[PDB]
Design an enzyme around this catalytic site. Structure first.
Site, PDB file in Angstrom:
ATOM      1  N   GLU A 126     -30.061  24.387  48.753  1.00 37.37           N
ATOM      2  CA  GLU A 126     -29.089  24.640  47.684  1.00 37.37           C
ATOM      3  C   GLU A 126     -29.227  26.026  47.032  1.00 37.37           C
ATOM      4  OE1 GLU A 126     -28.509  21.472  44.912  1.00 37.37           O
ATOM      5  OE2 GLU A 126     -28.095  19.986  46.454  1.00 37.37           O
ATOM      6  N   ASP A 143     -20.149  25.924  41.946  1.00 44.48           N
ATOM      7  CA  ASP A 143     -20.431  24.823  42.869  1.00 44.48           C
ATOM      8  C   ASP A 143     -19.176  24.420  43.644  1.00 44.48           C
ATOM      9  N   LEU A 196     -26.216  21.924  37.357  1.00 43.24           N
ATOM     10  CA  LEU A 196     -24.908  22.068  36.734  1.00 43.24           C
ATOM     11  C   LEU A 196     -25.018  22.467  35.265  1.00 43.24           C
ATOM     12  CD1 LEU A 196     -22.786  21.166  38.927  1.00 43.24           C
ATOM     13  CD2 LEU A 196     -21.847  19.755  37.065  1.00 43.24           C
ATOM     14  N   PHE A 200     -29.366  14.973  45.358  1.00 42.17           N
ATOM     15  CA  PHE A 200     -28.979  16.299  44.887  1.00 42.17           C
ATOM     16  C   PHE A 200     -27.653  16.771  45.480  1.00 42.17           C
ATOM     17  CE2 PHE A 200     -32.921  16.810  42.766  1.00 42.17           C
ATOM     18  CZ  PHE A 200     -32.855  17.969  42.017  1.00 42.17           C
ATOM     19  N   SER A 254     -28.342   2.649  57.224  1.00 43.74           N
ATOM     20  CA  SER A 254     -29.507   3.510  57.364  1.00 43.74           C
ATOM     21  C   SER A 254     -30.516   3.204  56.260  1.00 43.74           C
ATOM     22  CB  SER A 254     -29.082   4.977  57.296  1.00 43.74           C
ATOM     23  OG  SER A 254     -27.815   5.172  57.904  1.00 43.74           O
ATOM     24  N   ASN A 271     -28.689   6.696  62.810  1.00 40.97           N
ATOM     25  CA  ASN A 271     -27.741   6.006  61.934  1.00 40.97           C
ATOM     26  C   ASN A 271     -27.444   6.829  60.670  1.00 40.97           C
ATOM     27  OD1 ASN A 271     -27.271   3.435  59.723  1.00 40.97           O
ATOM     28  ND2 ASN A 271     -26.183   3.313  61.683  1.00 40.97           N
TER      29      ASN A 271
END
Lengths: 331, 291
Positions: B163, B172, B184, B232, B245, B260
């Site tokens: 990120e 963003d 944020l 995140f 999963s 998966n």
């Protein structure tokens, strides 16, 4: 793997003491130790002066008394129990006492000292403090006598009322000599029916009204006669009202709390004799007592009609105001 | 020392005397196993640590101060620490032990107990390190931030890759105003603190989510990083929607989960990050990120 979490609570029968470092301790003896303030957090051991089997451990500035069956370096040997009962019996006025609170199990004793070598009167005031209520209500409370024997009490209330008794017999004995104990109703000088130690029964000239009032007071059919024990109760009740009135008094209340309970009783003695306002109107003699000038206050108290009207009684009270003991009363 | 006997202590050490007995009201002195210059005194169930320059029977020699920065340094997360709180005056140190040889994660959780607020707020906090040197902290928040910085060493590098560590305000991919690390101008330190805060958030949000909390408990620190990473990127609700999963980790079976996850729109929408995270989930190691 294994993490230990240790917290505050004391939730069962392991004998860990509750609030071990709460409240305050009244001590007439100061320890010393080191100059560094921050090590009272650390254990400091010291023998109590003039005593034996009385090592103390200081921590957070509080004295803790500790006993062990197995031979130990920092622990005291197990103390024997006194033959003075917790329900009845008393400790004498001229002995100091040590009041403790805490636990015992499997031959190990840990007790927080609340009162270290203080008088019965001082301890009564001290245990009655609110801050102390928590430690005295959740632990076993005992008194370590002068001869290092012990009196264990079932509860704090039993102890303090035991102590209440210990102080009150002395004022009873003293006043027995000065005023007389009468177990049958008797009509006094003015013509008022009385019993015990100067207890007025009624403002009525009828013996029957008196016998009736006595019954009302004792709570049984007495037929004009009571036991030494009931007389004592009537006395204690009268004492308690005399102290009550001393507090509502602007001139007596100050000189009151500033004396040792022996002298406080010498004041109660006058209150029984010439009533509260009569004693109140002494004025100049009270202030000298406050200032702790006993030889001088005694000299001013003699300069009175009271010393004149009752020489022998006034000397005993005045000698009781000189030496804060009960020396004047013997045989 | 204020509240010296308040709150609670966490310890990985088991003393050689009875617990929960009248017995603990008498002092006990232990010499901590394996450690030199580490005598302790137990009273009322608490260990007290003491240093005096003066020679003493039941005290420690003055401990050397660590050269690690209290404001931006870390201690290796592989190392146990001791956390203490107390006072110093005239060459004498009295410290109540709050965490005895605990992991960093254990310490963080323990110093957050409200029962411990008063004592950590009103005394001096310090860590006694594995090598017997000490880091003294200006205040407990700084300690907390120090620990948090020490456990996040790995997840920080992971998320700074996925990120990016931006100091100046960027936009963003949803119109949202975003700074730091998917949060944020600021400094790398100021960012790191925000990140710590947002890791806290994600973990708090994960526990409070019925679908994630159980599968998160059955994970080691590394696979946890993978899960935090996913949150995140898409949020608790998005992650939790991976039920297929997701359950394969709560049965500890990987590989069957590694594919998966590639079944997902998620893998297709952001393949590079997703292969990394998936790989992290598979191996339970950091070999997808170490470059």
């Amino acid at each position: 793997f294994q993490s230990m979490s240790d917290t505050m609570v004391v939730n069962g029968s392991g004998g860990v003491p509750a609030f071990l470092f709460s409240g305050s301790t009244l001590s007439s003896y100061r320890p010393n130790f080191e100059a560094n303030s921050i090590t009272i957090a650390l254990p400091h051991y010291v023998d109590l002066p003039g005593r034996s089997n009385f090592k103390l451990m200081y921590i957070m500035g509080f004295p803790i008394d500790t006993e062990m069956e197995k031979d130990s370096e920092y622990s005291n040997k197990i103390r024997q129990e006194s033959k003075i009962s917790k329900t009845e019996g008393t400790v004498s006025y001229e002995q100091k006492i040590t009041v403790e609170t805490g636990q015992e199990k499997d031959g190990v004793k840990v007790y927080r000292v609340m009162v270290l070598e203080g008088t019965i009167a001082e301890s009564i005031e001290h245990l009655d403090k609110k801050e102390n209520e928590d430690i005295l209500n959740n632990n076993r409370n005992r008194i370590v006598l002068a001869d290092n024997t012990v009196i264990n009490f079932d509860n704090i209330s039993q102890l303090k009322e035991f102590l209440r008794r210990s102080v009150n017999i002395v004022i009873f004995e003293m006043l027995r000599i000065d005023e007389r104990l009468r177990l049958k109703i008797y009509k006094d000088t003015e013509g008022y029916y009385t019993i015990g130690i100067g207890h007025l029964l009624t403002k009525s000239p009828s013996l029957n009204a008196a016998k009736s009032e006595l019954d009302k007071a004792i709570g049984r059919n007495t037929n004009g006669v009571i036991t030494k024990d009931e007389a004592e109760k009537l006395f204690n009740q009268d004492v308690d009202a005399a102290v009550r009135g001393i507090l509502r008094n602007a001139k007596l209340k100050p000189v009151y709390d500033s004396l040792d309970a022996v002298r406080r009783a010498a004041l109660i003695n006058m209150v029984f004799q010439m009533g509260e306002t009569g004693v109140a109107g002494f004025t100049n003699s009270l202030r000298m007592l406050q200032q702790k000038r006993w030889d001088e206050a005694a000299v001013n108290l003699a300069k009175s009609i009271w010393y004149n009207q009752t020489p022998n009684r006034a000397k005993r009270v005045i000698t009781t105001f000189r030496t804060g003991t009960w020396d004047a009363y013997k045989n």
